[PDB]
Design a protein around this nucleic acid. Structure first.
Ligand SMILES: [Mg+2]
Ligand SMILES: [Mg+2]
Lengths: 735, 579
DNA sequence: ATAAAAA
DNA sequence: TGAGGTAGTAGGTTGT
DNA sequence: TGAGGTAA
């Protein structure tokens, strides 16, 4: 079947004119381009020619000889009267920054010059009319994000996707007045605000407050802007609101000033609105694609180039998207789970995964260590419920992992609500009294009755970060444990809540086993490349995961990093771990792939090359027949691709099957994996992959990454987005 | 598109074939029968941690469709039986109903185990095929052989079109095709009701707010709930006046103790005999469910049909609010709706206000186009009591009347029909072109002959012309005659889905099924058919079915959700609580 | 496998 | 905190 | 007892 894509083709490039006018080095070139683009009000399309770098500028606008104050010296910049011609059928890679930047600039200018629209950043434009009928104090604004695309067919495309923003109804006017300037000032600095300023709406970052408008000198200025305004801001502006200082969210400039009346406040999607909002922006395939088509037809029409016409078409791209196949999984006592086609076996994939794990236990059958059951004392939470819960948990674990020994109990008191004194009292007194400093354990959070919020999580966070290297724990809430047993004395699980308690216990036991590095299952067939090294660094902490063929060998390693010392530490860790582990699990490695999260600066490739050279010096690995490279994985996709399948059902659009991939360049691809066999509400989101260096094959890397996606260890019954290496790094490395 | 039916063709003899199938199916070792047309397996599930086991099985029947062949209809079934102790008595391998109990669908014992009996179209239509292939083979035609087939019947099933609804201030809602308009049909229905308001703008009677006393409930929670309810009910129906409040003492709670004082002490003194009122049930603290259920039954049934009562639960009302510390004033100690808990409270209040308007006989909307027949009559014989609804053209005139049935019951029913028709025909639908009675349950000709007598009397008085008029009787089955299940075969990854709303299937020219639940709504599992059978009269069955389906779209209780019964029978079930 | 927290 | 994804970025023309 | 279908 065919799939409708999120791309609209620009069918006018054959008659477009184009023109020309001419790390530290990269930063200096970027700074030069930013400065010329700011003073010429146009796009910069920096070009490399004859081992030299020039700033591209279209021939209409002039450029006066001057100097730019760079960090080593003020480089002179000079107009070159020579003008170059680009035809419609020769857009070679040195000219790829051209065409792209010109079209981008033109589209952004013409879209920002619209009436019922405004821009949030370089590529996000939202409506000025919020959603109707919201009973809260939060307005929801609906808009789009667009991007230019250079699909390998030879045509440029516009990619448009939906987006929502949450902004309070009124800010800095009914929240802070002149009587409490110093009271709540610290609750607003560093945030992001929306400024209306008549009919030129833009986002800002506030650097602090100031005096009032009648004293700070800026009346008769804003009155000029609100005079020629389609919105009556005369009533909004009063000579009592104080003057606030703002800068642009991009970078730093002089601290401009403005009134506090017109400024609304934005929310990142973590502060409030969780489970009370965020459900309005979840749209299925048909609704979302209809909204996208309406946006394209409403605003991306009759666009004008510099002299010509921009003919952006309708009826978005229709192609035939190929997919990878679901890999075959391996469980305890063989017991393979493989998919033969589009049959009933594919329908129950997740359920059969969970059932096989439940029946056969975990695949990793090594020994265990000393375990604890940190639990409140006898006066709080009592003892009979604790004993019943311990009995049930021990029975389930011994059914799952037959090497389990015992579940030694440790009691602590709670006293009062401090969250810092109870930190020492709870685990630095009783645990220090015993020899229970090395182990795994699992803690039961005290939340029986009338627990106050906004601190327990803090306590929980502290509970997850004190003895990280030696006491990796898994938390649990006593409110949910006490919600199944009822007094009869003795305690018994209520008859009505038997399946729910079973599911709770199964998930809790599986998570505790995951903390113990006991992987429930692994792939049956070997990957194309033997070694996969997933790297993820954040919050000053780095995490490495080594994945050998089949996954039967997954080794996690955390590290502390502070930048040359960082590169040296990375190289040392990679070399030491590879030299230790290659002769054991992967003799004569075929290839090494580094899946890096974030952005790659070339340090990973250098470390891998040095390690390979040292390994070849040791004679462990060859040099003529070996591949090694770095592949970057983007959590947030570069271009917002969406895919839906065309079906004859009453809902004409459907989510694509799991594993559907589309590549745009020779070294850039997108994978969809949360599709048919799993159940989701909304549209599947893409996963973006792109090589950086090396001599690997991109098809093999993409297929192996998709194979790693199918290894779901946390909740086997649900879908998975990240591959197992990055998911494991995120699950561990809690501090 | 092509649809798949649950019909497996066999390639009078009806009772003989049923006897053969029953006798051969009773011999299977892992197959114990429970009724004439119900079988089950001799094994429960695995991984069941309760004290009650469940038993899978199938429901079986024969069909005599108009094609000219006999067909087999099969659908799933589930039984609940306790393991430790009607009974399931034992005699060797012969197990039959007459040392284990057979549970019922009520009580908490089964309520936690019900998701296992709900299967979607793909799972259900593969289980049916497995049951057919496994057990429904090697069947014998006594001495001969019976070819129970597979690859179920595939037909081009037609459907009715969703009628155009009429709301307040016109503002109709119509469906033009399989476009984005029909996708949001239920949401548009609810939104139009919320915006325009109810269609009926008649005046209100006296209403009350009888709630528990101060010793059990605060004096500000009830005030806030009453204010919000009043605001919503004034926005919907602008003719509402006020919601005066009556306070009654709790006087403990053991077993129907509060009922004795409820009428003689507070209700009689304040002269609250006539009204509609709204009652909050006291269960704020720890409560015994039996006392609350008995209190609800006695409150609904103690008073004769005067002062029809709609109730509510104090627990949800208290949970929907928060005791603010009245920062700004002194001693207010008011309660407010939680900011994060506004949408659910809005839905709660909307549904409660809609229910209180239904019990006040204020219908929200109606159909724009007139039905093919002018008069529709819905008769139900409740326990010792009966209820009648009269449905005139389009839906703007719906009348309800209860009656105590004391045989002379036919005389009373005939007299009621005659007086109601002679009162109402000249006012709303002069010169009717057809009268249809829709009876819930089974008909025995009493209602038909009563209608015939009333028509003869009215023609004697010249109210309705006898030559041009028609009358008929149709029977509604709440449990279907045969368990027909259909699904739509699609190109998607899941190859089956529920049929669209309006899919009808006529088994015989006098019996058929309608699938009201379908695409524009969302359900878990497969839609169940509503079964209609025209017994006597001179009507056209197709027109009656179309009008009944158009009546199903009149969902007065929950406009957002789908409706299974026509509005006349649903109104009887709602407003015919015992006495 | 189960309903929500989520028109 | 039993858990999953869907919702949710980066944020250079300039808009005192 | 806020309310619908699906389970019966
Ligand atoms: Mg009710
Ligand atoms: Mg966790």
């Amino acid at each position: 079947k065919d799939h409708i894509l999120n791309l609209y083709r620009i069918d006018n490039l054959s008659e477009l004119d184009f023109s020309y006018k001419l790390e530290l080095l990269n930063k200096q070139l970027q700074k030069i381009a930013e400065e010329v683009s700011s003073v010429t009000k146009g796009p910069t399309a920096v070009l490399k020619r004859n081992q030299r770098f020039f700033v591209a500028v279209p021939a209409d606008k002039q450029m006066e000889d001057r100097s730019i104050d760079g960090i080593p010296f003020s480089i002179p910049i000079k107009l070159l009267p020579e003008v170059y011609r680009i035809d419609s059928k020769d857009i070679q890679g040195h000219q790829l920054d051209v065409v792209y930047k010109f079209l981008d600039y033109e589209i952004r200018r013409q879209l920002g010059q619209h009436r019922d629209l405004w821009k949030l950043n370089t590529h996000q434009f939202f409506l000025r009319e919020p959603m109707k009928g919201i009973q809260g104090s939060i307005n929801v604004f609906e808009g789009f994000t667009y991007k230019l695309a250079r699909l390998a067919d030879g045509h440029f495309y516009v990619t448009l996707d939906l987006s929502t923003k949450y902004i309070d109804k009124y800010c800095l006017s009914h929240y802070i007045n002149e009587g409490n300037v110093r009271t709540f000032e610290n609750n607003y600095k560093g945030r992001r605000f929306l400024y209306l300023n008549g009919d030129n709406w833009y986002t800002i970052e506030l650097l602090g407050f100031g005096k009032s408008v009648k004293e700070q000198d800026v009346l008769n200025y804003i009155t000029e802007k609100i005079e020629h305004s389609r919105t009556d801001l005369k009533r909004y502006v009063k000579p009592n609101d104080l003057s606030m200082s703002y800068t642009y969210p991009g970078r730093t400039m002089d601290p401009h000033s403005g009134a506090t009346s017109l400024a609304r406040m934005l929310y990142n999607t973590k502060d409030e609105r969780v489970k009370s909002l965020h459900y309005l922006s979840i749209k299925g395939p048909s609704k979302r694609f209809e909204a996208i088509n309406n946006y394209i037809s409403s605003y991306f029409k009759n666009l004008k180039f510099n002299a010509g016409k921009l003919l952006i078409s309708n009826e978005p791209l229709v192609e035939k998207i190929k997919n990878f196949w679901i890999p075959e999984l391996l469980f305890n006592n063989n017991r393979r789970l493989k998919i033969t086609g589009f049959n009933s076996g594919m329908r129950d994939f997740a359920y059969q995964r969970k059932q096989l794990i439940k029946n056969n236990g975990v695949l990793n059958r090594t020994s265990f260590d000393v375990q604890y059951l940190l639990v409140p004392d006898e006066q709080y939470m009592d003892a009979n419920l604790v004993e019943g819960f311990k009995n049930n948990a021990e029975f389930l674990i011994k059914k799952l992992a037959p090497a389990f020994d015992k579940f030694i109990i440790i009691r602590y008191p709670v006293k009062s609500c401090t969250s810092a004194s109870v930190q020492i009292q709870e685990i630095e007194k009783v645990l220090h009294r015993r020899n229970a400093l090395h182990g795994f354990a699992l803690v039961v959070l005290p939340d029986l009755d009338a627990f106050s919020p906004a601190f327990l999580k803090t306590f929980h966070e502290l509970l997850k970060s004190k003895f990280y290297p030696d006491l990796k724990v898994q938390c649990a809430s006593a409110h949910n444990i006490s919600s199944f047993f009822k007094p009869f004395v003795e305690y018994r699980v209520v008859e009505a809540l038997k399946g729910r308690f079973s599911s709770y216990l199964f998930y809790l036991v599986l998570e505790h086993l995951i903390v113990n590095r006991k992987w429930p299952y692994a792939l049956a067939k070997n990957l194309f490349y033997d070694i996969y090294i997933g790297i993820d660094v954040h919050d000053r902490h780095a995490g490495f995961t080594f994945f050998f063929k089949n996954g039967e060998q997954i080794i996690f390693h955390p590290e502390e990093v502070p930048e040359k010392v960082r590169a040296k530490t990375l190289n040392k860790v990679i070399y030491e771990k590879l030299k230790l582990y290659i002769p054991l699990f992967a003799p004569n490695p075929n290839g090494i792939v580094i899946v890096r999260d974030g952005r790659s600066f070339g340090v990973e490739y250098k470390a891998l090359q040095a390690a390979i050279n040292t390994l070849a010096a040791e004679g462990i690995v060859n040099k003529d027949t070996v591949k090694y490279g770095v592949v970057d994985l983007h959590k947030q996709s570069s271009v917002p691709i969406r895919i839906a399948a065309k079906t004859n059902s009453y809902d004409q659009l459907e989510n694509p099957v799991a594993g559907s991939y589309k590549l745009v360049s020779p070294k850039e691809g997108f994978i969809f994996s949360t599709g048919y066999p799993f159940d989701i509400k909304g549209t599947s989101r893409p996963l973006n992959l792109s090589m950086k260096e090396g001599d690997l094959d991109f098809m093999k890397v993409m297929e192996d990454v998709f194979c790693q996606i199918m290894l779901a260890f946390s909740a086997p019954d649900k879908s998975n987005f990240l591959p197992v290496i990055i998911k494991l790094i995120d699950t561990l490395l809690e501090p | 598109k092509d649809h798949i039916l649950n019909l497996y063709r066999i390639d009078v003899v009806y009772k003989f074939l049923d006897y053969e199938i029953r006798r051969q199916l009773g011999q299977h070792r892992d197959l114990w029968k429970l009724n004439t047309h119900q079988f089950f397996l001799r094994e429960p599930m695995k991984g069941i941690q309760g004290s009650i086991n469940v038993f899978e099985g199938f429901t079986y029947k024969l069909a005599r469709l108009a094609d000219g062949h006999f067909y087999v209809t099969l659908d799933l079934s589930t039984k609940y039986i306790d393991k430790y102790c009607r009974f399931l008595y034992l005699n060797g391998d012969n197990w039959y109903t007459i040392a284990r109990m057979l549970y019922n669908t009520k009580d908490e014992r089964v309520k936690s185990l019900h998701y296992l009996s709900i299967k979607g179209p793909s799972k259900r239509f593969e289980a049916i095929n497995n049951y057919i292939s496994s057990y429904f083979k090697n069947l014998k035609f006594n001495a001969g052989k019976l070819l129970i087939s597979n690859e179920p019947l595939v037909e081009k099933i037609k459907n009715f079109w969703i009628p155009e609804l009429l709301f307040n201030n016109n503002r109709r809602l119509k469906i033009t095709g399989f476009n984005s308009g029909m996708r949001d049909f239920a949401y548009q229905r609810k939104q139009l009701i919320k915006n325009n308001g109810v269609l009926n703008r008649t005046s209100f009677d006296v209403q009350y707010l009888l709630v528990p006393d101060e010793q059990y409930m605060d004096a500000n929670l009830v005030e806030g709930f009453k204010n919000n309810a009043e605001f919503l009910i004034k926005k919907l129906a602008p003719a509402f006046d006020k919601f005066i409040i009556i306070r009654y003492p709790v006087k403990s709670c053991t077993s129907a103790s509060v009922q004795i004082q409820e009428i003689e002490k507070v209700l009689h003194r304040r002269n609250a005999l006539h009204g509609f009122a709204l009652v909050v049930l006291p269960d704020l603290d720890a409560f015994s469910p039996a006392f609350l259920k008995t209190f609800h039954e006695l409150l609904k049934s103690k008073f004769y049909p005067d002062l029809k009562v709609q109730c509510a639960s104090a627990h949800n009302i208290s949970s929907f609010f928060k005791p603010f510390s009245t920062a700004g004033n002194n001693g207010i100690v008011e309660y407010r709706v939680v900011e994060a808990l506004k949408g659910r409270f809005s839905s709660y209040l909307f549904y409660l206000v809609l229910e209180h308007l239904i019990v006040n006989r204020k219908w929200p909307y109606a159909l724009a186009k007139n039905l093919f027949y002018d008069i529709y009559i819905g008769i139900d014989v409740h326990d010792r009591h009966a209820g009648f609804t009269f449905f005139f053209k389009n839906g703007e005139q719906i009348i309800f009347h209860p009656e105590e049935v004391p045989k002379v019951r036919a005389k009373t029913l005939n007299k009621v029909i005659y007086e109601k028709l002679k009162l109402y025909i000249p006012l709303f639908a002069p010169n009717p072109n057809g009268i249809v009675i829709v009876r819930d349950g089974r008909s025995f000709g009493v209602e038909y002959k009563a209608l015939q007598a009333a028509i003869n009397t009215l023609a004697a008085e010249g109210i309705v012309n006898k030559d041009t008029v028609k009358y008929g009787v149709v029977d509604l089955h709440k449990q279907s005659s045969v368990p027909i299940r259909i699904a739509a075969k699609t190109n998607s990854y899941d190859q089956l889905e529920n049929p669209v709303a309006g899919s009808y299937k006529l088994v015989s020219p006098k019996e058929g099924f309608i699938f009201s639940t379908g695409y524009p709504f969302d359900i878990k599992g497969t839609s169940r058919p509503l079964n209609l059978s025209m017994k006597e009269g001179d009507l056209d069955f197709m027109k009656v079915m179309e009008d009944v389906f158009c009546q199903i779209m009149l969902a007065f209780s929950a406009p957002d959700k789908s409706n299974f019964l026509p509005v006349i029978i649903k109104l009887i079930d709602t407003l015919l609580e015992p006495l």
